[PDB]
Every structure is written in C-alpha cells, then in structure tokens.
C-alpha cells in the first residue's frame, strides 16, 4: 500500500505542579507531527503555531463561548480529572525486585561484569548505585537507562565493569519512592 | 512539572482509523474501543475506581475527521512522511529456565500509526497468549506500541518479533533466545 497518508492529532494536556496548586492546560492541534494551533492557559487565547493554524486561531478567538470554555478547563477538566484518577496514578507505588548476577562481555571470558537488574517498579524515578566493600564504585558503570514496560511498570539494568575477586563484597543499592530506606543486595564471588 | 495527563486523539486517512486515549506520565490510563464503544482500562483495577462514558469519544473523533479534511486541503494535500520504527525485544524479568516470563516487543518512534506485528517462535507465528497496546503518543508526536508474549524459557526455542511498517524497506525482525 503506497497511498499517501494524512494524519490529524489532538492533545489536550493538563500539567500539574505541587498537586493541583498550579495547573496549566494546553489544547493542541497537529497535522502529521506539526503543531499548527494551540490554546495555552497561561495566555487565555488560541495562538497559531504555524501559518496553517492562522484561520483557526482567528475564528476561535472571535467566539467568547469557546474562549471561556477553554479558560475554565484548568478547573473543570484538569483539576476534576486529577481528582478522579490520583489515587491509582499519582499515589501508585510498586517496589522494585532486585537481582544481582555476574556476566561476561564475550562468552569465553572469565566474569568481567556484574549486573544489577531492577524490575517491576513504579514510578520511574530511581537511583541505582554500586559499592565494593562499602565504597561506591563510579568508574565503569553502564546501564540500559530507564525502560518503560508499557504496563505501568519500569525496569533498568545497571552493570559494573569489573572482575569479581574472592573476598570482595559487591552491593547494588536502590533508592525509589516506594521504599523508606535504600534496598541493598549483596553479591560475593564465592557466595 | 510534577505530573501530566493527556487526552490524545488521532484520525488517519485513507485508513479511516481513529483512536482516543488518556495518558498519565507516559503510561496509558485507558482507551476507547471505537467499534464496540467500550472503555478499556489499561489495568483492570482502574475501572473499579473510575468510569468514562465511551460514547463521548466518538464525537471527538468525528470532529477530528472533519478537521483532517480541512487541514489536508490547507496543506495542498501534503502527505505524511513515513518514519520507520526502532524495535527492541526484552524480557520483563531476569530469565531462568522453566520459570514463566514475558517477552516484550517495544516498537518506538514511528509514524503513521499503522503496523503489522507478529511473534515468531522457531520461525512460526504465535497467537496463543499474546496481547498488545494501542498506539501511544510521544512528546515528539510520533508513536510507540508494545506487544507481549508470555513464555516458558527453554534452550530449544528461539523468538522473533517481526514488525512491518511503510517506512521500512523490509520487515524488521528482532531476535531473542536463551543466554
């Protein structure tokens, strides 16, 4: 199928700061990926983002009913919906499962990686640190970054590029909003 | 900010595909099954706490269709440029033999929002147990999408997520096997 495609998108966005104390509403219209016109509650009228949106900004701004409907949206739409969903979204906390295991960059090498796999957590903000004998290791740390699973959970793998020695104690430490103190998992080469 | 809730809509010609969904910080709260006129909560628990009148979404999509006609003309029928997806396959947890896990196929950074996605096990299509999300919005106004396959890890099976998109010259296969 080589027929040309044409796409219209609309995004009605509610941005919340400090709960519902400060709220910003955006009414955004797109042709393909190009935003062409927008209502920003900081302004209180539509503004053309590209020339394509000029006729809409001009006509919509001439209609006081449209403007007042949009100007009230921070309250009647944003604050309302926040109240409806906050208990299972804003308040959602799922603690991470943490696993540590050794690995090798190439298959016939001796272990030269330690992997800290942090799985199943929500929300996304997380801090993962490596320690060797109680001292933080900052050199040779690499990660997948934050991975969204698409199902209201996240995961991340954080690797330490080191060759485990007998007698060493390695610790992966995880900080996350669902936890009241850091979660630590220890790993030893002769464990 | 602290949180963002987005009601995201699209309408696509000539496919006549429309979608309506709510997003919270990058996760889907719900979408409307436009054919069945039903609200589909992303997590089942969500629907015990909130409701949404699915019927209402049809009106928005109808406006978006009308607006698309208007904008198509304004642009002198300038069509969308295909942006092919980045595709990644991962498991949701560390793999152990004979311990149930889930394969995730992540299809990202693409437009238009039309794709054919197939799970392959040992080169053969799998349909048992599979699930998927609708097209999810990105801040750059492209799309992303997830497909899922629950599985029992074994040394004998190999998997591929096969993705077809008009921006690709051939189907993209992303492989996974144990180890």
């Amino acid at each position: 199928d080589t027929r040309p495609r044409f796409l219209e998108q609309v995004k009605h966005e509610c941005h919340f700061f400090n709960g519902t104390e400060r709220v910003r509403f955006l009414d955004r219209y797109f042709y393909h990926q190009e935003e062409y016109v927008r209502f920003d509650s900081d302004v209180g009228e539509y503004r053309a983002v590209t020339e394509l949106g000029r006729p809409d900004a001009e006509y919509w701004n001439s209609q006081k009913d449209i403007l007042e409907d949009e100007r009230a949206a921070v309250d009647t739409y944003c604050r309302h919906n926040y109240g409806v969903v906050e208990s299972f979204t804003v308040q959602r906390r799922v603690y991470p499962e943490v696993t540590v295991y050794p690995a090798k960059t190439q298959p016939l090498q001796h272990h030269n990686l330690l992997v800290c796999s942090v799985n199943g957590f929500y929300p996304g903000s997380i801090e993962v640190r490596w320690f060797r004998n109680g001292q933080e290791e900052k050199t040779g740390v690499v990660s997948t970054g934050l991975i969204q699973n698409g199902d209201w959970t996240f995961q991340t793998l954080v690797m330490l590029e080191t060759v485990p020695r007998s007698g060493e104690v390695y610790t992966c430490q995880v900080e996350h909003p669902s936890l009241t103190s850091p979660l630590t998992v220890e790993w030893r080469a002769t464990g | 900010e602290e949180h963002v809730i987005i009601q995201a809509e699209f309408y696509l010609n000539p496919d006549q595909s429309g979608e309506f969904m709510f997003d919270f910080d990058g996760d889907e709260i719900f979408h409307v099954d436009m054919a069945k006129k039903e609200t589909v909560w992303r997590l089942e628990e969500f629907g015990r706490f909130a409701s949404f009148e699915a019927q209402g979404a049809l009106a928005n999509i109808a406006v978006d269709k009308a607006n698309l006609e208007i904008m198509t003309k304004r642009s002198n029928y300038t069509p969308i440029t295909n942006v092919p997806p980045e595709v990644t396959v991962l498991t949701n947890s560390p793999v152990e033999l004979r311990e149930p896990n889930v394969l995730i196929c992540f299809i990202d950074k693409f437009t238009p929002p039309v794709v054919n996605v197939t799970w392959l096990r040992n080169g053969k299509p799998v349909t048992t147990g599979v699930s998927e999300t609708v097209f999810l919005p990105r801040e750059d106004h492209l799309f992303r999408k997830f497909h899922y396959l629950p599985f029992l890890p074994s040394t004998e099976d190999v998997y591929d997520c096969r993705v077809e998109h008009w921006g690709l010259d051939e189907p993209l296969l992303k492989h996974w096997e144990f180890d």
């Binding site: 009605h12 219209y29 006509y59 949206a73 409806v84 | 009106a59 009308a66």
Partner: peptide, 13 residues
Amino acid sequence: SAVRLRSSVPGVR
C-alpha cells in the same frame, strides 16, 4: 467518579 473528556474544536472550513 467519572473522567471528563475535553471536546475538540471544529476548524474553519
């Protein structure tokens, strides 16, 4: 409670 939709505004023909 019920989630409210925001209407999409019809453009100029």
